[PDB]
Each structure stands twice: as structure tokens, then as C-alpha cells.
Amino acid sequence: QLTTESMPFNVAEGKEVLLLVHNLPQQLFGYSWYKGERADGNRQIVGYAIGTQQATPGPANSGRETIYPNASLLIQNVTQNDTGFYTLQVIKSDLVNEEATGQFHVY
Amino acid sequence: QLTTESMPFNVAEGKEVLLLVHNLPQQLFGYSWYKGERADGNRQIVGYAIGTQQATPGPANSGRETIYPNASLLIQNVTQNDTGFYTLQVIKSDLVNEEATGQFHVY
Ligand code: NI
């Protein structure tokens, strides 16, 4: 069952958090992470295509995010404006896609 | 900008609606249609793979839906329950995606 987890859940301003991804299904084109609680293009952070290991930023990219081959997202030098929810969308090769929403709190 | 237009917007019960698609982006991998206002997997009608030309039903498929290679969706035998919003997500090859949401009303 596709989920995320925030490491740590409570993040000091300036510090870092890892959004870790469990249970990626088989046969993927790629990954798409978003800010907020849904897949929304205006709030896309990064697109990652797995056969080419190419990452492409979206409208919400700050420059402080790093996406990994297993879908995990590290954000560095966390700001109060990074607080709350994020969404991962996993794109399957039949286009029947899966989403996972997680969150952390900046203090 | 990606848009959809319902043809016709106003549908008699038991008739047909074509959700047309304007301004597809470049270099894409496939399409995803959903019931409602968001790209939620649990409300996915259909995923269409442009590469292979293959449509896979999602969970919200009723057997009345037909997707065309240009992303337009046909809903046949419409009921009073179908009035509302429908969302396409177009999955691009750099996985940085776009959505557009339209609607129809059944009398
Ligand atoms: Ni009415």
C-alpha cells in the first residue's frame, strides 16, 4: 500500500527532512511530487522519469529539494513556508496512477 | 493552456457527452481521466498509454466510457448521478504534468 513518511515529523527551521516512500508498485514511468494534498500541476515540485534518471522541476520547486531513484524527497534549509502537506504521485506504464500524501511541521 | 469543453454541456438523461480536449502539450506519455475535481486514483475512470495505444479502466470506470487518442472522453447513457466534474491529467515525458477539469449537467 503506497505511503510516505517524514523524517523527522517535526523539523527545526533551517534544518532538513526526508520524505521516504514505501511500497512503490512495479512497472513505473516515473514520479511526481507536489506541494499540498493533491496532484496539482501549479503546485508541482519535481517530475522524475526513472529510465533516464532525469529530474525536472515544476512551478513549486525552490531549489532546496532532492529527489532519489526510490522516490524519496529530501528538502534542505527548511522554511516555515515548506510546512504541511506533500503529495507523491507514482505514474505506472498503464497510466493507472497512485497517490500518497504525507506531512511535516516546521517550527 | 490545457482545457476541456463538454459537448454538449447540457445533456438529456440517457444521451451522450464528449469531453473534448484543447491544447495538449508536447511529448507526452499518456492520459488519465477522473471523476471529480482532482487526480485521485480511487476515482480514476481510465488510463491511456499513448506509446502502446492502450486504455486500462480504473476503479471509477462504469463501462460507458471511451477514450480517444487525442484525450477526448465519451460518456454514453448518462444518468442523473453523472452531473458534475471530470478531470484529465496529461502525463508528460519529463513527468511534469498538467490537469484540466470540466463538467456537464444532466436533465
Ligand atoms: Ni439540474
Select the residue from A40, A50, A54, A96 to test the B interface by mutation, using most B Cβ atoms within 10 A.
Answer: A96
Quick one: closest CA in A to B49, which residue?
Answer: A94
Distances (CA, A) of A7 to A39, A64, A100, B95: 22, 16, 16, 25
Q: What is the DSSP string of B4-46?
A: EEEESSEE-TT--EEEEEE-PPSSEEEEEEEESSS--GGGEEE
Q: Which of A30, A94, A98 sits opposite B54 (nearest CB)?
A: A94
- Name all contacts of A2-10 with Cβ < 8 Å and 24+ positions apart: A2/A88, A2/A90, A2/A98, A2/A99, A2/A100, A3/A100, A3/A102, A4/A86, A4/A88, A4/A100, A4/A101, A4/A102, A5/A102, A6/A102, A6/A103, A6/A104, A8/A104, A9/A103, A9/A104, A9/A105, A10/A104, A10/A105, A10/A107
Q: Which residues are CB-contacts of A61 (< 8 A; sequence separation ≥ 6)?
A: A44, A45, A46
Method of structure determination: X-ray
Alpha-carbon torsion angle B36, B38, B41, B43, nearest 10: 0
The structure was resolved to a resolution in Å of: 1.9
Distance of alpha carbon B79 from alpha carbon A22, whole angstroms: 39
Using the mean position of ligand 1's atoms as its centre, give its distance from the Cα of residue A24 in Å.
Answer: 42
Q: Which residues of A touch B32 (CB under 8 A)?
A: 95-97
Which of A49, A60, A27, A12 shows the shortest CA–CA distance to B52? A27
Q: Grid coordinates standing for B91?
A: 502525463
d(CA B85, ligand 1 centre) in Å: 14
Cell of A7: 523524517
Residues in chain A: 107
